[PDB]
């Protein structure tokens with residue numbers, strides 16, 4: 283990428299759901315660390331806030347089960363506007379970043395539409411300088427994120443009290 287110092291690569295996705303936005307904002311953003319463990323206990327050992335109160339500045343730690351190739355991830359809540367279902371958060375540490383990635387930055391913005399939602403999600407990979415993004419790992423991340431979203435949607439539809 284010379285003469286550049288660094289690069290950033292972005293995926294933009296738009297989605298629609300029958301789940302109301304405040305419920306998705308909790309399940310998929312603010313309490314994702316908890317919900318991953320509930321949804322996929324054979325993959326995730328634990329998910330915990332290790333700094334902060336659940337608003338801006340929070341750091342979470344998600345730990346995979348010992349048998350899984352991956353070990354842990356740290357995310358930081360960089361910006362939250364909960365009234366308007368906006369969050370920016372960053373995956374800044376963990377062996378899911380492999381050798382090549384410095385951080386992944388996520389932006390989520392939801393809106394209410396009838397009894398459901400629409401959302402825009404923006405995922406930006408920041409390779410370390412001199413390193414290249416691995417397309418395989420990006421596509422796995424995307425597929426797993428989508429699968430998890432669908433699991434959450436199904437559970438929330440079936441259990442209206444959750445995150446109500």
Ligand SMILES: COc1ccc2[nH]cc(CCNC(C)=O)c2c1
Nearest residue numbers: 322325352378422423426427430
């Ligand atoms: C969404 O939940 C899952 C479930 C199973 C999984 N396996 C491996 C990953 C990590 C995927 N990479 C990133 C950057 O997310 C994963 C995530």
Ligand SMILES: COc1ccc2[nH]cc(CCNC(C)=O)c2c1
Nearest residue numbers: 309317320321433434437438444
């Ligand atoms: C307890 O709270 C929650 C909250 C959000 C959730 N999403 C998913 C599940 C679990 C069940 N899912 C399956 C079998 O696919 C879940 C539980």
Ligand code: NA
Nearest residue numbers: 297298299300
């Ligand atoms: Na959908």
Ligand code: NA
Nearest residue numbers: 347348350352
């Ligand atoms: Na592991």
Ligand code: NA
Nearest residue numbers: 405423424427
């Ligand atoms: Na992704």
